[PDB]
Design a protein around this ligand. Sequence first.
Ligand SMILES: N[C@@H](Cc1cc(I)c(Oc2cc(I)c(O)c(I)c2)c(I)c1)C(=O)O
Lengths: 220, 212
Amino acid sequence: EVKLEESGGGLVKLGGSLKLSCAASGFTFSSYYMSWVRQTPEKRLELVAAINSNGGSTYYPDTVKGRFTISRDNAKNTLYLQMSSLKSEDTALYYCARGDYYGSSLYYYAMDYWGQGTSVTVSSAKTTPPSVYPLAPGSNSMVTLGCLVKGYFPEPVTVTWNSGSLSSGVHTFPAVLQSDLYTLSSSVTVPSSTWPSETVTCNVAHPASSTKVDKKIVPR
Amino acid sequence: DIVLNQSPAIMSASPGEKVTMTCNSSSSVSYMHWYQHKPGSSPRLLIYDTSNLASGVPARFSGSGSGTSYSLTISRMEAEDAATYYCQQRSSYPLTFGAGTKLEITRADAAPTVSIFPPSSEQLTSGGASVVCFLNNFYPKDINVKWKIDGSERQNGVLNSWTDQDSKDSTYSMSSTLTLTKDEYERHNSYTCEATHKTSTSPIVKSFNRNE
Ligand SMILES: N[C@@H](Cc1cc(I)c(Oc2cc(I)c(O)c(I)c2)c(I)c1)C(=O)O
């Protein structure tokens, strides 16, 4: 069972630095080429760094050369990426990925296993907690309610309904960035027999500001 | 960085249907890999060196190509084949990826359920006013929303967002938020969300009156 598990992502200002780690298990780490690949917000995939079996050779595209340093400790079965002089366009999800077996006799330059990724945001925008607003109708056997999670930074937030008890009938929409702040909404549809006769509450969390809000949806 | 151009950017197929997508290169490359990527998981090596299936990959997948044009084919689509597919060239450094072909599932056309919401008292208290419209569980993905205040369309200050295709019923949903000043909000009465879609001859209209 191959496992790659990244850590270290976070929010950093323009020109800042971050150090990413990837813990490898399930295989002979020291026998494989390893790489870092990133998924951009527009879902492009970009190689950012590769390293051979020992720490001897490394490769960087010109876009990060001189800014990023990839290393590895084969004792600790650990891959590292030191990211410096960071730029807005380094914002991405960073995957740790395994390349060729050292003695393959035929290198493919393919990534046969990828970690789940660690998330990096490079921006100078100010971290801001969300305002959480209840969405109730003005005035069907079902009723749709909502929460508007507005004016926060950075991503992500999480939204649940009735502490996770309402799972079906929920749509949490991807946040939209405008002028250095994100807005996100979430809808929940429930039987009209359950609201307003019973309580419907959206539970919003924004780790990056340590904010957690429980907003009941009050009729009228 | 060799540029790879995947087509189509997005496509949909019914289960059972044959699917082909292409990766065309601005330069010659000697081999091409393909990767499968689904929301909720990380990319999966699908084909390596143009036409070899990676471990675990079903024989409905095949790859071909040479020179400047390469393709991926599913002989008979399964629902679990919904994903974004990326090609990667391995003939020049840096290794580069195409932008992805998002493969969606075709289902029956479904009209949206439309709901409109006034600003909260919480938000008005702070000096702003957002009106929200949800357009839920529709198919196909293309849809248009129009905001009208007192009968006149507003196009600026509108943020829209679509969900990914639903894993259970294969529909889409979309949310639209029109943000105003409280002062402009309190100066108008009629607020309307208007939706046009393949499934309506005229727009679906939801509205509220600030005086009610
Ligand atoms: N002159 C050197 C240049 C080079 C070194 C590395 I280190 C590298 O990074 C990888 C990434 C993967 I993924 C692999 O499977 C392998 I093998 C190497 C790449 I791209 C190019 C050469 O031509 O080898």
